[PDB]
Structure formats: structure tokens, C-alpha cells
Amino acid sequence: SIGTLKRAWIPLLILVVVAIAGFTVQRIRTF
Amino acid sequence: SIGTLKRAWIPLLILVVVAIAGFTVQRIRTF
Amino acid sequence: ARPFIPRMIRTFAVPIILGWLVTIAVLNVTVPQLETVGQIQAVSMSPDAAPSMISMKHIGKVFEEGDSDSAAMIVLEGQRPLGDAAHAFYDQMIGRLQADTTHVQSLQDFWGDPLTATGAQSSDGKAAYVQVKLAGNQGESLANESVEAVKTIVERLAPPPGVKVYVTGSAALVADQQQAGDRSLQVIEAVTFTVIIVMLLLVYRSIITSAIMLTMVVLGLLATRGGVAFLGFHRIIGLSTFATNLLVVLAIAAATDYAIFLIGRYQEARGLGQDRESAYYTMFGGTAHVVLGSGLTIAGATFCLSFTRLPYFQTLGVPLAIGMVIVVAAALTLGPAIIAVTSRFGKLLEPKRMARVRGWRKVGAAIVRWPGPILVGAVALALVGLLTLPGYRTNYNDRNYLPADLPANEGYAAAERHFSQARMNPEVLMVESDHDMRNSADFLVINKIAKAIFAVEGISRVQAITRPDGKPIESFYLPPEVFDNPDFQRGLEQFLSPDGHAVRFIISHEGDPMSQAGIARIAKIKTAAKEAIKGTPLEGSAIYLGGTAAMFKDLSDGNTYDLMIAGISALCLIFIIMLITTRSVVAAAVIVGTVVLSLGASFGLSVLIWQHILGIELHWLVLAMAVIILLAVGADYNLLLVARLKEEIHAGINTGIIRAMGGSGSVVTAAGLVFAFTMMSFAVSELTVMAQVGTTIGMGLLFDTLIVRSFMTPSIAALLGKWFWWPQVVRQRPIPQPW
Amino acid sequence: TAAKEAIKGTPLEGSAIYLGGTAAMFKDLSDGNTYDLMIAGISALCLIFIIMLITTRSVV
């Protein structure tokens, strides 16, 4: 909903950033 | 006169655009 | 008073409806379908002026082997090394193959002769192949029935036990690709029809309005199909399977855009609070010129697409132009007539639960007050899209975009188990000089040419008269008395010209010969041959190179030049139609820049999704179809949005932005989501090319509709303010009236 | 590459080519250096973004 998304936007954004970062790092370590 | 240049500025501008477009397309066509 | 054209269409509505129905019925009864007239009137896919096609015709003419470039191969493999039963089967099979004349013209019998048998056999001996040159150019029907005839001739007899036979080659590939595209249009069509019906039930929230809108699209599609089939059947214009595929997909696109435009404008007009007749007249007066201008500029761009130098695009422009004229005529006459007759029949088309309008006015209020930061965010997402664009590669091999159940694919798998090379797709290099080539020193020169071609990085085998097996790694000498042994004479007719004025080499690559490296190898091959003939008395000859990779390099060069030509023509026509519509040069420049930036960002995002995450490269037809369809639809929605913005500016520019957004952005995004998800549901296809094209168009148009057209063009408009309409003198806001 | 095109056609086609020394070691270290600098830069910049986001509660 709106309230639970705008209430906890901070842990969601850290979660999304670390998710993309982990995906990219796991991609580069294959090289 | 300046009246013939400021009353037909849209057709003259379109004519210049089509002229340069046809020149460039005919130039690339022979490559 | 009241305009004349909508009154004329309104009063005579049901004669127009019945006449359109009768015309559609006649064109779809007395004229056969579009796939059949595309099949019987196909064209070649390579230019006649392309150097590869000229070289292939010249090779066919000198050696007297026909006037066709199509070829296939017959492969025999066994679980044991092949014996005399395989020899008897091979001799009988080539006898019955040489019996056929009207389908097959040439057959390169290599395994029959024991000199070239070592060049026509596997290292372990459990495989053999023969090349047969058929009738008809590639992309034609004649090659397809030649492939069918040769494969049923091969399959007609029972092979000896332990030995199996398959058909391979590029002609087998294109025949099986046509068969696969024929038989893979049932279940993906099922999921496409159900996603269309759920999307229309989501957008319109009614079962009646969706029914009328589907009637509009299907009637326009049938009218366009019948008209193009009529003009093509009586040999007035030309057709192709590619032309009919792109024509039908762009026809569905344009028809659903125009239907959604007319219905949305009518429903908004009735939601304003006026009765059903002036609602019809105001929706006509609002969007009729919009549809007219949009359809004519798409028709002009697709007609200017015909001024190019590639057969994939020359044969497409006139059918697209004519089909778009029928689409515009249908959406202008049949559309409003059936809207009127379903309006006055009773209570059919009703506005109910109008909540998209208020939300889009909220979005407009957000974009007006803070144009700066929202523009920075939209440009940040655009730069997220753009940075992966410079890294982008392509593949031309069509085997790895097809299901593995095709007989050509299992023949390829059987060939790959015993051959370490790409022996199924060879290349032919002919050198033509002005004197007789049956001489010892000239044979030394031929060996020098073969050795020089062999040393190119990536070339695995070269077969010449000097070294038939493919290992020119020794010093060579040849005494002149070899011209009396009849087996060497058979080899001489196999390799040299019958008149002795041309020599040919058969070249087999390494790995994938249709990759980018395989494209780049052939220029080095020609250069190596050219410096091989320097200093000899053979200096000054004509060097011809033919094969699959030569054709694909020719097509890629033509593709990039043709992309530049069509891009310049399309952007100039877009600038012109914006210049008529707005009477503003800065607004036209803004719109053209937004279109080109949006196209680049969308194609970059598609490349990021497919090449980097999923791990498989893109095609090049995907780039071509994507840029054509997205250019057309983006011109359409941009013209409608800018025309609605121009329509009300007298009561302020910021109020103009919010009112134009709340009146047009909902219609534009409804059409965008409907067509984007309709093209998106092609991703379940087992055909990789059409899945790539469908999802590239889907995600590109989703990015276009959700970010660029909703948050970037209104931001630039509100940021530039009253300098968005230069040269015209417009106020930022009107004179402040009293309360 | 010169060795690989030298063994072509001859019956040692498909052999194994092994190359070692100081220069080979340094080429492997340099390639690993550029990929690992990319990895370390990504991780460090993401963590700096995280700590600035908790401290100030603002993304700009």
C-alpha cells in the first residue's frame, strides 16, 4: 500500500541498491 | 521586398528543409 | 454553424457501413489470402548489384552450373566406418539425383572420385557429404519446392542398416524456417488473443466498448489486407512475406491507436457534460485533422523508405504506403459512422468511473510546479538507458534463433559430431585471368594463392586443385605429364574452368562463420588473394568471392547505409509535419530531439536486457523493425499530444499543460499500454527472432509512454515557457482578470 | 596466437599450449587488477551511498 511503502522507503532503497550491487559483483567475479 | 519574405517563411523554410534532405539522401544513395 | 464532412459522414452512415462491408467481402472472397500471394510473388533478398550476387552469378556462368545461388548438402553418417554398401548407396543416390533436372541442376560429386574422397570424408570415416545446387534464388518459392523435391527423393528409399541420411545447408535452413514460422502461429496466438481481451477489459472496464473497438480494428485490418491483396494479385505492385508481416503488425498498431483516440475523445467529450450529438461533432473536429496528419506523415515516411538500396526495404515502402492510406480512410469514414450508429441505437457507449482523468491532472500539476527536478530525474533515467548503448554486438547466424526440433538442426548436429569446422557453409573464390591455366608455373602460382589464403587467421580448410584434402602445408611441384591420366582430367574439370580461364577454391572457416569475426575474415581473404597474385604473370585478374558470409557482409553494409537514409527521411518528415501543426520551429526541434533520444534510450535498455542479463545477442531485423514501428507510433502520439497542447493555450501555458495532460495523456497511455502488452506477449514464442522483436518493441514503447512522453516533454515545455512557441508571440499567462 | 596458427594443419592440431614466465604473470595480474578495481569501486561507492543515506535521510 501507500503507507507501508512511504513509511519504509529507506530500507527498501538500501535493499534494492545492495541487490543490484550484489548482482553486478557476482557477475564480475565470474570473469 | 520584406513582405514576400516574412509572409511565406513557412513554405520557404519547408523548401529549404526538403532541398537539403533530398540532396543528402541522393548523396548517401550512391554509396 | 457546422462543418460539412462530419455532417455528410453522419447522415449517410449506414450506406457507408454497408458499402465498406461489401467491399471487404469482395476483396476477401474473390482474391486469395496474403500469404499465398506473397508466396507466389516473392522476390530475392540480395541486391542484383551486390558484389556477392554478381560473383555467384559469374561462378555459375563460367563453370556452366546454372544461374542460382541456392545450395544444399546431403550427409551420410554411421556408427561404424563406412564401407562398400555406403559406396553403392552413394552411387545410386547421385544417379537418381542427376535424373532430376527441373529441380536440381548441379551436383558436386566429390566422394565418387578417390582423389577428392579424402577431402569429402571425416577424419574417423563415420561421415560423408555431397553438395547439390538447386533452382531458384534464396527467398523465392522455387528454392523451397526444390528443397522439398530433393528431400523426398532422398527419403523415398531405405538406407542400408547402420547408416543414416540428412539434408543440411542454407536452403534447408530457410525452407525449415518458413515451415516453422508456418506451424508456430497457434498457441502464441492463443495467449495473444487472451492478453488483448484482458487488456481491453482492464482499460475500458466494459464488455460492449471493447467489442466495438475490436470490430473497428478487425474491419480495418480486413479492408487493408483485401486492398493490398487485390493490388498485388493483378501484378500492379509487388509483395513479400516480410512486407506482409510488417504490414499486418503496423496495421494493427495504427488501427488500435486511431480507434482508441476516437473512442477516448468521444468519451471525454460526453464526460464533460454535453449531449451525444455535439459530443460526436467536437470529437470529430478535435481529432480528425490529428488522425489525417499523423496518417499522412507515417505514409510519407514509409514511402520515402522506398528510396533505398536493400531488397528487404525497397519492396516494403509502397505496400506500407497504400495500406496506411486504406487505414486512414477506414478510420476516418467507417470509424465515426459506426460510433454514430452505436451512439444513436441506444445506450451503448457510456462514460463510467472516470478516475484516470483526475490522476493525470494530478500528474500534470506535479510536472508544472517543479519542471526542473523532474526533468533531471527523467534525464537521469534516460542516461541510465543510454550508457549501455555503445556496447552492442550482432549475430547473423540464424541456426541459434530456431527451435532444435527442425530436421536441418539435427542434420547440423550430426555434422558437428564428426566435423570440427563449419563445413556445411563453404565459400568459393574464383580467379579469372585472360589466358589458359593448364601450365606448371601457373599451377605454382595457384598453390601460392592457396597457401596465402590458408594463412588468414580463422581459415581452417582451403580446397584447391593442388591440395584437394585441405592441407597446403608442403612445397609443391608437378611434372607436366599428368595431363594424360583421365582421373586427373576429371579433377581438372572439377576445379578449373572448361575453357581454362578461371580457377576456384573452396574455403571452410573456423567456428561460427556468420559471426562478426566471420564477416570480417572475407575482406582479409580478398586482400590476401590480391597480394598473392602480385608480381606473377597472373597479376591483373578478376577476383570473385561468393558464399553466405559475403552475402551477409553485403547486407550489413547496406543495412547501415539504409538506416542512415531512412532515419534522415523520417526525421525530416517529422520536422515538416510538426512545422505545419504548430507553426513553431523551436517546438518542432524539441519534439525531434525528444524522439531521437527516446529511441536511443529504449534500444539501449533492450540491449541491456537481452545481451547482458540473459546472455544471447540480438538480431539485426530486430533493430530494423523496432526503429520503424517505434518511429511511426511515436510520431502519432507526439502529434496528438502537441496538437492537444496547442488547442488550449489562451488560458495560460501552465494551465495549458495540466489541461492538455488530463485531456490527452490518458488516451495516449491507454493506447500505449494496450499495444505494448500486445507486442509483449510474443515472448513465449519458441521462435527467438519474433520473441526478440516483440519484447523489444514492448519494453521500448513502455519506456516511451511511461517516462519520456509523460515526464520529459511537458517538463521541457513548461521550462521553456513562452519560448516554446517561437516565432509566434504568446503570453506566459493572460491578463489578470478580476475575481 | 603464433603458436596456435603454427600447429594448424599438421598432425599436432588440437594440442595444448602452455605459456609461463614473468611477463605472463604480469599480464594476468594486470587483467585481474582492472576487474578487481571495478569490483572494489562498486562496493566502496555503494557503502558510502548507504552511510550517507542513513545519516542524512536524503537521496539527493
Author numbering:
A (entry chain C), B (entry chain A): 1 to 31
C (entry chain E): 20 to 493, 688 to 952
D (entry chain F): 740 to 799
Original paper wording:
Bedaquiline, an antitubercular drug that targets ATP-synthase, is a key component of a new oral drug regimen that has revolutionized the treatment of multi drug resistant tuberculosis. Clinical bedaquiline resistance in Mycobacterium tuberculosis has rapidly emerged, primarily due to mutations in the transcriptional repressor, Rv0678 that result in upregulation of the Resistance-Nodulation-Division (RND) efflux pump MmpS5/MmpL5 (MmpS5L5). Here, to understand how MmpS5L5 effluxes bedaquiline, we determined the structure of the MmpS5L5 complex using cryo-electron microscopy, revealing a novel trimeric architecture distinct from the canonical tripartite RND efflux pumps of Gram-negative bacteria. Structure prediction modelling in conjunction with functional genetic analysis indicates that it uses a periplasmic coiled-coil tube to transport molecules across the cell wall.
While currently known clinical resistance to bedaquiline is due to pump upregulation, our findings that several MmpL5 variants increase bedaquiline efflux may presage the emergence of additional modes of clinical resistance.
